[PDB]
Structure formats: C-alpha cells, structure tokens
C-alpha cells in the first residue's frame, strides 16, 4: 500500500527520510543524513511494488540519493534496496551501496556497503 | 561527463537501459531485462552527480527498477550504484542489489548482489 | 587479543560459531547453521588482525564455511567479513556473501548478501 | 573441477593468488596485492566444495586474508566468495568484502565491496 510507505521515517543513526508513494509505483521525497559529507536535504527518487503479494510477504522497494544539493557536493550516490514490512511496528529493512566518483586507478575503493533499518514515525 | 549518459546502453548479458539525464541530477527511462522473471520494459528512476569533479574522476550515479509492469510482477526491486566514465568508449560500471519481498522467516535469503557493465554497443 | 575472540558465539537467528584464535592470526573452529540446507557442524577457517590498533578500534577478521560435511552438501560457501568489538558486551558485527555453484547462464543469481551480529557466551 | 584450483592465479589488477586445494575442502596459500596498504605476501586460508555437482555447475569457494605480515599492518581483512569454472580457460569469479577495524562512530564506512576475476595468465 502506498499510504503505509508514505510518511516520515528515521534510521538507527538518526537520518530522516520523508517519502510519498505514488499509485504508479513511484517514490519521491527528501533525505537528511546524519553522517558523511552532507548537509540539509537531498532529493530522493525510487520505485516500489504497488501490488505486493498478500501473505506476510514484505513489499520490495529501492531508492537513490545523489549527494549534491545547493549547499554541498560529495560526488557520490547511495542506493538503498530492501523491503517494507507493515505491522504496528512498521519497518523498512535495507541494504545499501554508496559509490564515490573516482579515477580509474582508485576504482577498487569506490563502493561502500552496509545496512539500514528505518522506523516510521509520521505520515 | 554529464550529457553523455543520455542514450541506449547494454550490459554484458544483453539487457537494454534507455536513459535521459536531466540538468539537475534526474535519471529517467526504461529497462528491459535479458534475465529473470521479467518481460518487456519497466520504468526506472535515479539520480547522478550533475557537477562532477574536474580531475580524472567518474560521475557517480544510481537507479532503481521495481519489477512490475502491465505484463508481470516479480515482487522484487533492483538498485544499481556505480559511475559513468566518458571517453571514446564510454561505460557505466555498477554493482547492484536485487531484493525480493519475503516472509520474515526467509528474510536472510532476500537479497542477491552482482555487478553489471554497460556500454553503447 | 586472540583470547577475547576464542569462545562460543551465537547470532540473531540461533546459529552457533565455536572458534579458537591462534597467535599467528589463524581462526579455526566449527559452524552450526540455524537456516538453509545444512545439518550438524561444518569446518570453518579464517584470519584476524593479531595486532590491532589500541584506540577504541575494532579488530578486523573474516572466515569461510563451505557447506559440505559428512552428512550433507549444499554446493555453496559463505564468507563473513567484519570486526570484533571487545567490551562487557563483546560482539562480532559482520556482513556476509553466500555463493552457490551454478551453471554459466544462472551465475547472475549465485550470490546472496546479508549481515550477522554475534554475541559471545563461553570461552 | 577439483584439483585445477591448485596453482598460481592473477586477477585483473595484477594481484597474485598462490593456492593449494586439499582433498577434503581446505584452501591454503599466499596472496600478494597490487593495490592498497600492503607489501609482499600475506597468508590466506579458505574452503571449497570438494565434491561439486556433475551438471554444468561451478565449484563454490571462499578465502580470507588479514592484511598483516612482518612488514605492514593495514588493520583490515578481505573475504572473497565465488566459484571456480574449469575448462580450457579456467577462471575463478568472485565478489569480495574488505572490512577495516574502525571506532563505533565510523562503523558505517568500514566495508568496501567489489569483484575480482582470476585466471592463470
């Protein structure tokens, strides 16, 4: 359900994700990062399964933030890939990749991997 | 650098990636997969660095495809994260994560990782 | 410290890791998996930093289990890569890759990624 | 399949991997990196499937190197997970995770991911 995804979410490090889920499967919003070379809000775009399986299956989704806004440019982009699990503790569990632009010779150290869990506060 | 990202790209397995790079960092287009539970095109959306560095560095980008269109629904989504390297032979070098919607019991086996290289040939 | 790593550990799904850290940087022991096509114990081998930085830095380590013992063969191998953090709640936080042997055409779906946290019980 | 893993291998960047595959699943040998805060050889240890499938499947394997030897200590460890494909041109296709020991504050930026392909040339 788009509505269940729409809202304000925060992860374990204190970053803020504001998102709207559109009926066509689109995700749009802003990301505020608690860590890294970042300040203020960044534009996010993603896609989610707008017709998930009933069961107790999660809803698969993903989004990207490129770390450039009008105040700073970190020359990197993070994608989060995971699933939304709806309940009375609604969570988005993800794994992420962070790639920095590098020269050809430093490209072996361009991509960080980690995982983030998001807890919903507001719609 | 910048606008050379717009175009039709192909990865090592024959999947086709058709993208438009907007001036302010948006990536929009369609993807058609050569593998998996997919048929025809799927919508993608992403972001890229619209003011990259001026030393020899690549352009950082990323995009997502949710594998649902009017024909099929695999209940999964892939994100690709990587960089664009322009030149006489431009390439987009990426690593990707494919997450399927699972029950909580099967959540440990929900995410595949791999890598794709796209060129204009 | 090798001693601090040596012991019995369990992760969030109920798998058991028994390990000895050798003074040359070697890790040897057995793994018992709570999930997957697995039964009874499997041999593990790894390496760790036997001279870590003092600070409050973790100790980097990694190990491999190939999922074949005398009772079952899953034709796969998992590597865990992470760090040991010593404290009165001693933890090993890892990220893992699980690769299955596949044909050339199915090789795009050969590798799973996830993360595991281990809590120490015994030496 | 099986014993063809023993040998000297090289990846795309010139790193050299010298391995012995034991009969019961052990991998033992040395690694010398072409990149990073490393010099000379480092000990590796791993495991592989000693009875793989008989259909067209690769041999699953994995190994770890902690980047400390008598010369240097990078306080990090890499694990490679992948499969061996034998034939006229054998290859080991892998993906890897490099974790550095960090403080708790920097734990989000502790792990790099990439991919390496090893051949006997």
From Swiss-Prot, chains A, C:
Q: Which UniProt keywords apply?
A: Biotin, Secreted, Signal
Instruction: Specify the Avidin-like domain's residue ranges.
Output: 1-123
Instruction: Report the residue ranges where the short sequence motif Cell attachment site is annotated in this entry.
Output: 47-49
GO cellular component terms given for this protein: extracellular region
Give the top-rank taxon of the lineage listed in the UniProt record for this protein: Bacteria
What does it do? The biological function of streptavidin is not known. Forms a strong non-covalent specific complex with biotin (one molecule of biotin per subunit of streptavidin).
Tell me how this protein assembles: Homotetramer.
Output this protein's name.
Answer: Streptavidin
| Residues shown, of full length | 37 to 159 of 183
């Amino acid at each position: 359900a788009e509505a269940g995804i729409t809202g304000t979410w925060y992860n374990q490090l204190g970053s803020t994700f504001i998102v709207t889920a559109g009926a066509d499967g689109a995700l749009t919003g802003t990301y505020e990062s608690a860590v890294g070379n970042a300040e203020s809000r960044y534009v996010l775009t993603g896609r989610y399964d707008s017709a998930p399986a009933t069961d107790g299956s999660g809803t698969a989704l993903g989004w990207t933030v490129a770390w450039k806004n009008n105040y700073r440019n970190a020359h990197s982009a993070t994608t989060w890939s995971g699933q939304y699990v709806g309940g009375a503790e609604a969570r988005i569990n993800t794994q992420w990749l962070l790639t920095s632009g590098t020269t050809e010779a430093n490209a072996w150290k361009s991509t960080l991997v980690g995982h983030d869990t998001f807890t919903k506060v507001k719609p």
